[PDB]
Amino acid sequence: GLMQFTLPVRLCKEIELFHFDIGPFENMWPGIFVYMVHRSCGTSCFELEKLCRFIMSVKKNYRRVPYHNWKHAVTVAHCMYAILQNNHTLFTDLERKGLLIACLCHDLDHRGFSNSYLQKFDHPLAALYSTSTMEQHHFSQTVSILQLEGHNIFSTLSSSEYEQVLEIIRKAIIATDLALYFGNRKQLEEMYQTGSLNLNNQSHRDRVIGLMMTACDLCSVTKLWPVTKLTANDIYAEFWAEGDEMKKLGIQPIPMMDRDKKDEVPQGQLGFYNAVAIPCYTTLTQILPPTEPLLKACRDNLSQWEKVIRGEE
Numbered sequence: 001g002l003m004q005f006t007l008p009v010r011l012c013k014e015i016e017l018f019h020f021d022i023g024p025f026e027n028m029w030p031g032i033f034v035y036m037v038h039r040s041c042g043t044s045c046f047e048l049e050k051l052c053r054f055i056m057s058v059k060k061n062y063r064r065v066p067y068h069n070w071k072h073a074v075t076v077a078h079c080m081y082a083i084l085q086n087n088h089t090l091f092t093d094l095e096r097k098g099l100l101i102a103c104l105c106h107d108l109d110h111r112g113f114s115n116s117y118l119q120k121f122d123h124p125l126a127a128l129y130s131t132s133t134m135e136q137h138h139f140s141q142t143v144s145i146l147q148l149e150g151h152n153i154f155s156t157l158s159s160s161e162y163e164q165v166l167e168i169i170r171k172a173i174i175a176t177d178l179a180l181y182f183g184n185r186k187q188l189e190e191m192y193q194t195g196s197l198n199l200n201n202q203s204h205r206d207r208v209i210g211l212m213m214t215a216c217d218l219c220s221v222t223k224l225w226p227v228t229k230l231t232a233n234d235i236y237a238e239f240w241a242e243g244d245e246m247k248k249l250g251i252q253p254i255p256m257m258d259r260d261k262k263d264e265v266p267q268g269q270l271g272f273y274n275a276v277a278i279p280c281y282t283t284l285t286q287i288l289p290p291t292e293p294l295l296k297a298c299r300d301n302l303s304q305w306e307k308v309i310r311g312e313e
């Protein structure tokens with residue numbers, strides 16, 4: 001009960017900031033997550049024994065892929081932790097419980113391939129899940145782990161509170177399908193501007209949580225430039241591998257996934273920042289003003305990619 005997780009001074013201070021990098025020591029990442037759970041939710045939210053056994057099962061079920069790996073899971077959870085901590089009173093107890101878990105589990109058993117490649121490969125999962133293929137799989141893996149003996153971290157919740165939290169996690173993980181982001185932010189943009197956005201309306205809370213999940217999932221672009229730049233290498237390592245696999249199916253991949261077209265990457269990043277990243281953090285900042293530092297960092301990184309195109313680096 002009285003066993004608190006404590007980090008070294010530099011981590012204790014920087015973990016509160018949006019642009020925190022969780023560092024290269026894999027064996028510290030579980031403690032970093034438990035720390036965030038305790039501060040964000042409370043020490044009483046989860047039985048420490050069950051939480052630690054849940055975390056280590058989740059870790060085992062992420063693969064050794066360049067980007068969609070255990071470090072991404074913890075990185076996304078940290079961005080969520082910084083959003084919740086900066087928006088103390090806006091979220092219920094169930095939401096703070098569910099959302100940190102959702103982020104940790106949002107990419108469980110990712111193979112480094114997109115929904116499009118699964119579809120064109122004719123992968124079994126594309127037969128079982130027609131849309132949001134990988135994200136339905138990620139939620140399925142999450143339920144599977146929660147049902148392992150000694151792994152049900154939500155055991156102390158009532159039947160209705162257990163169903164509510166598992167529904168928050170399901171919608172939260174499905175929201176990380178980027179195909180669904182574009183419509184979700186447009187609807188939120190309309191609701192904000194026409195003034196009809198209501199945080200007591202559950203349908204509106206769902207959309208706002210969806211956008212939060214996109215914000216955390218893309219948070220590679222909200223880091224200090226050296227982290228953003230080095231993470232981009234891991235991102236493109238997965239894209240170029242999928243491109244190779246598209247060429248093996250006899251399909252020319254989109255330039256984003258063609259390793260022959262690396263020269264085009266800097267302009268590709270501008271498109272992504274202007275079409276996905278900047279819009280996402282702008283709407284988030286409109287709804288949740290204290291998340292402004294994600295937008296600012298994102299704009300700083302947009303400017304660094306412009307400098308790359310201009311040959312200044």
Ligand SMILES: Cc1cc(N2CCCC2)nc(/C=C/c2ccc3ccccc3n2)n1
Binds near residue numbers: 221255256262264
């Ligand atoms: C049309 C186009 C072209 C392109 N190029 C790369 C080289 C050739 C053309 N890159 C993108 C965006 C990539 C992307 C996607 C998700 C991302 C998610 C997080 C961070 C960066 C991301 N970047 N889009």
Ligand SMILES: [Mg+2]
Binds near residue numbers: 177
């Ligand atoms: Mg995903």
Ligand SMILES: [Zn+2]
Binds near residue numbers: 072076107176217
């Ligand atoms: Zn992700």
